[model samples]
Target: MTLSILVAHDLQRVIGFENQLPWHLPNDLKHVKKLSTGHTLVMGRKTFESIGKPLPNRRNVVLTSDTSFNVEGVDVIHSIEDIYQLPGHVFIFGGQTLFEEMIDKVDDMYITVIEGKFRGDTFFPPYTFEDWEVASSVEGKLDEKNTIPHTFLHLIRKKLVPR
Candidate 1:
């Protein structure tokens, strides 16, 4: 399974209250759509809820213990292992917990490292420099109206080769 995690969160660990994000970073949303378009996407139920529903133009997969919940464009999964072969650039969108669980399963990570600290209750797992490399980086300042400075970093973890 080829997996990748996409995040457009803040420097602050804060994420969500009930499976949803309270902020809207349009660029990040666009980044996500562009990245996951034509590919499959997997997320936990709350993450699915936070996103409203299965997004258009992407194959949505959800992992949840609740057997009753299902969406038109989404496939329900019981665990991360349910969809074993995540072929061809699958994206992992999250509500923090889902991101943490899928870290070891993904090929690379696309992170929008906002330039300032935020007051929040969640954070993406710390990247192990030993396990990955900075494949690319684009630094920029937030609009004056925006509350923080930010840099978009594309950190690529070294590929695992077979023996």
Candidate 2:
């Protein structure tokens, strides 16, 4: 199984504000599902709440300390170990803290780099990407509905990181 990260951040690595996305880019939103569809999505409690439901077309797993937490259609996992070595590809979807825990465990990253900075409290954990190579990339087109300048990138680790 392959472990990867899926996150969107700005120039300052700011990912969220007020416990939710600080900005919106419809184009980047589409790219998330484009890559994650049909895969396992492991995320934190807040991230699951941010979306408010299981995102169809993917198996949603939420990590939380609340042992009794339950959702209608999502698996409420107690710890990160519940997702390790999961069959097939699994995405470490974000909510700040979740990204940090899986930072060194991911084999690659799917990033939506917003071209500018914004005020936000939640940040994408710092990783130099010194040993990661850009496997693929595409620039987002600007429009009335998608005004933010964003670029999608897939960064693969130079040497695969084993779980």
Candidate 3:
């Protein structure tokens, strides 16, 4: 499977607080829907709970250590290894743990870089340019509703980089 990560985080790398997104950028949610509508999305149990249900028009997979975990209309897998057996391009939607574990395995990343800090309890995992190259970046746009300027960036792993 071709794996990827789709995330939106503030300048401080904060993604969520108390199991919910700290900001309300409606455009970002639209961007997510635009990109992931036809693909398989994999997320951790916490992330799944935060959404409260399966996303429409896509295959939802939740990774959890609890073997007994089950949610209607979604696939539950006990280990990260099981995710590979799934078919098609898979997008990892995050909490923190899922991103940390799969960062090294993803082929690409679609990131929304919010240009300001927000109060948050969960943060995106730290990553470096050494393993990835910016494939494209959209100019920062101000979202009047959320009052934050954000840029959309696409990064692809550098396949031939020296270790």
Candidate 4:
């Protein structure tokens, strides 16, 4: 199954502040929902909480240090290794730690490039562009509702040769 990362970040690669996203971009939310529908979502507990509910039409799998942390309607996995048993393409949603843990395993990424500086305590892990090639990009217009001039980017990680 293809492993993909679905995330949005600002110019500074800042993705969140105070455990929440720093910007209000409805289009970005719609894009994520559309792409992740019917896929298995692997996310951290904080990311799950930030979303506030299990997303419809998708399998929700939460990764947490708390082995006893149980929420109705979603599978809880403590270790990242447990993800292998889950079938189908997996989308790694974030809260930084989960992203860092799964970055190397991701095959492709759907990224929203917000063109501005955002202040946030939480940030997306640093990744080099050389390791990934842009598969496609959609340049977005500046909208009155969503003021951020953003671009939707799809990046595929370069395949590595086995040692």
Candidate number of the best lDDT = 3
Per-residue lDDT of candidate 2, residues 61-116 (tens digit) = 89999988888878878878888847889999988999989888888999889999
TM-score of decoy 4: 0.93
For model 1 the local lDDT of residue 67 reads 86
Error of model 1, residue 70, in angstroms: 2.0
lDDT of 4 by residue, 89-133 (tens): 898989799888888888899999988999998888888888999
Record all residue pairs in model 2 with backbone atoms less than 3 Å apart, i.e. clashing. none
| Residue range 7-106, candidate 3, lDDT tens digits | 9999999999999998878888989999999899999999999999999999999998888888888999888898889899899999799888988888
TM-score of each: 0.83, 0.93, 0.93, 0.93
Better model by TM-score: candidate 2 vs candidate 3: 2
Model 2 TM-score, 2 decimals: 0.93
Clashes of each: 4, 0, 0, 0
Q: Which portions of model 3 miss their true places by more than 4 Å?
A: 161-163
lDDT of each: 0.73, 0.88, 0.90, 0.89
Between candidates 1 and 4, which one is better according to lDDT? 4
